[PDB]
Structure 1
């Protein structure tokens, strides 16, 4: 049951999560300038809304 190290695998799963999160985040780098402008405006909305909420 242990011949393929289970504790090593459950310590390896942060690397799996990091690779998955990196592949997911790389979808935002699609190379489209209109999306870059849109993401800047989204970030502006988020920053202003956070500042108004926090006051």
Structure 2
């Protein structure tokens, strides 16, 4: 059961989660400029919402 080292692998999951979450963020980028402006509107929406809950 110790032919492969368990705790080295189970503390590598920060790197696994970071790399996979980084790949998802790269896939979130599109290149189509309409969604860039939609990102600007949706940042304005959340900033005003986050300011009105304060």
Gapped regions of structure 1 (runs ≥ 5): none
RMSD, aligned CA: 0.7
Q: CA deviation at 1:13?
A: 0.7
Mapped partners of 1:31, 1:8: distance in 2: 39
Give me the TM-score of the superposition, normalised by structure 2: 0.93
Residue in structure 1 matched with residue 2 of structure 2 by the alignment: 2
C-alpha distance after superposition, 1:12-41 (max 9, x if no partner):
111000011101111221101000000111
Q: CA deviation at 1:3?
A: 1.1
Of Structure 1 and Structure 2, which has the larger fraction of its residues in helix? 1
Gapped regions of structure 2 (runs ≥ 5): none
Give me the TM-score of the superposition, normalised by structure 1: 0.91
Corresponding pairs, count: 54
